[PDB]
Amino acid sequence: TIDTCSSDSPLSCQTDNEASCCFNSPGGSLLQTQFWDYDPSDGPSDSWTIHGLWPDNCDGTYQEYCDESREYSNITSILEAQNRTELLSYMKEYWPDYEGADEDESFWEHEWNKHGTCINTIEPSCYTDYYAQEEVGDFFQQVVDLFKTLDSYTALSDAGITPSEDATYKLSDIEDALAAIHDGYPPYVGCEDGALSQLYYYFNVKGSAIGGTYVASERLEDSNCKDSGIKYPPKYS
Ligand SMILES: *[C@@H]1O[C@H](CO)[C@@H](O[C@@H]2O[C@H](CO)[C@@H](O)[C@H](O)[C@H]2NC(C)=O)[C@H](O)[C@H]1NC(C)=O
Ligand SMILES: *[C@@H]1O[C@H](CO)[C@@H](O)[C@H](O)[C@H]1NC(C)=O
Known part of the structure; x- marks a missing residue:
C-alpha cells in the first residue's frame, strides 16, 4: 500500500523542500472542492456533493493532465476490481454528475485524468507492493x-444559513460559517447566477496526499459572489 511518512513531515507550500513521495510539490495546495447542484438537483436535499481534489501550485496556478500513461476510461471497473464497492456506492450518491448516474463515469474519469495524475505523491513509485491502478482507487477513497x-x-445551517426560496445571504456570513469547519480559513465561495454553487477548501499536506495530514490553509482565490443578495436555492424545490 502507499508509503507512510512521518507525522512531523514538512508542510507543503509553507516550507521549502524537494518533491518526493513525502512532499507535495509543485502541487502543494490541495483543494477539496464541492458543488451545490439545484437545477438540476442531485445528492441529498441537505448535503453538498463532491466536485474533486485538486493540486494547485503554491501561487494558485495549477498543472492539469500530468500523465497520459495513467489516464483511464474505466474508473468504475477499476474500483470494482479493487472491491471498493462501498466507495463506489458512496460516489454514486455524493459524487454525482448532475446530468445523471450514466454520466458519473465520464465525470470521475475527468477528475482522475485532469487532477489526480498531477498529485506527485500518488505515483506508483510511492507504493510498496504496488498493484496496477492502486493509486486510482486510493485517490477516490482519499477525496x-x-x-x-x-x-x-x-x-x-448551524450559522442560520439554510436553502430558501426567499431569504438571501451575505458573503461574509457564508465565509465565517464555513471557516468554522476549516480552522478559521474560509473556502473559496463560488456563485452562479447569484446563487451559491461551489466551494474550494484549501489545504497544505504533511506527508503523502494519501494518508498524510491535511492542514487547513488560506484560500488562493476569494469569491466571485456579490457581497450580499446571495441565493441558496432549495434542492428538488
Ligand atoms: C482499466 O483500463 C486500463 C487501461 O487500459 C487497464 O490497464 C491495462 O490493462 C491492459 C489489458 O489487460 C494491460 O495489458 C495494460 O498493461 C494495462 N495498462 C496499464 C497502464 O496498467 C486496466 O486493466 C483496466 N482495469 C479494469 C479493471 O478493467
Ligand atoms: C478483490 O477480491 C478479489 C477476489 O477475492 C481478489 O482476487 C483481489 O485481489 C481483491 N483486490 C483487492 C485490492 O482487494
Missing part, C-alpha cells in the same frame, strides 16, 4: 475521506 470532514451544509 471521500476529506469530503466527509467538510460538511458545508451543516456548517452553514
Whole structure:
C-alpha cells in the first residue's frame, strides 16, 4: 500500500523542500472542492456533493493532465476490481454528475485524468507492493475521506444559513460559517447566477496526499459572489 511518512513531515507550500513521495510539490495546495447542484438537483436535499481534489501550485496556478500513461476510461471497473464497492456506492450518491448516474463515469474519469495524475505523491513509485491502478482507487477513497470532514451544509445551517426560496445571504456570513469547519480559513465561495454553487477548501499536506495530514490553509482565490443578495436555492424545490 502507499508509503507512510512521518507525522512531523514538512508542510507543503509553507516550507521549502524537494518533491518526493513525502512532499507535495509543485502541487502543494490541495483543494477539496464541492458543488451545490439545484437545477438540476442531485445528492441529498441537505448535503453538498463532491466536485474533486485538486493540486494547485503554491501561487494558485495549477498543472492539469500530468500523465497520459495513467489516464483511464474505466474508473468504475477499476474500483470494482479493487472491491471498493462501498466507495463506489458512496460516489454514486455524493459524487454525482448532475446530468445523471450514466454520466458519473465520464465525470470521475475527468477528475482522475485532469487532477489526480498531477498529485506527485500518488505515483506508483510511492507504493510498496504496488498493484496496477492502486493509486486510482486510493485517490477516490482519499477525496471521500476529506469530503466527509467538510460538511458545508451543516456548517452553514448551524450559522442560520439554510436553502430558501426567499431569504438571501451575505458573503461574509457564508465565509465565517464555513471557516468554522476549516480552522478559521474560509473556502473559496463560488456563485452562479447569484446563487451559491461551489466551494474550494484549501489545504497544505504533511506527508503523502494519501494518508498524510491535511492542514487547513488560506484560500488562493476569494469569491466571485456579490457581497450580499446571495441565493441558496432549495434542492428538488
Ligand atoms: C482499466 O483500463 C486500463 C487501461 O487500459 C487497464 O490497464 C491495462 O490493462 C491492459 C489489458 O489487460 C494491460 O495489458 C495494460 O498493461 C494495462 N495498462 C496499464 C497502464 O496498467 C486496466 O486493466 C483496466 N482495469 C479494469 C479493471 O478493467
Ligand atoms: C478483490 O477480491 C478479489 C477476489 O477475492 C481478489 O482476487 C483481489 O485481489 C481483491 N483486490 C483487492 C485490492 O482487494
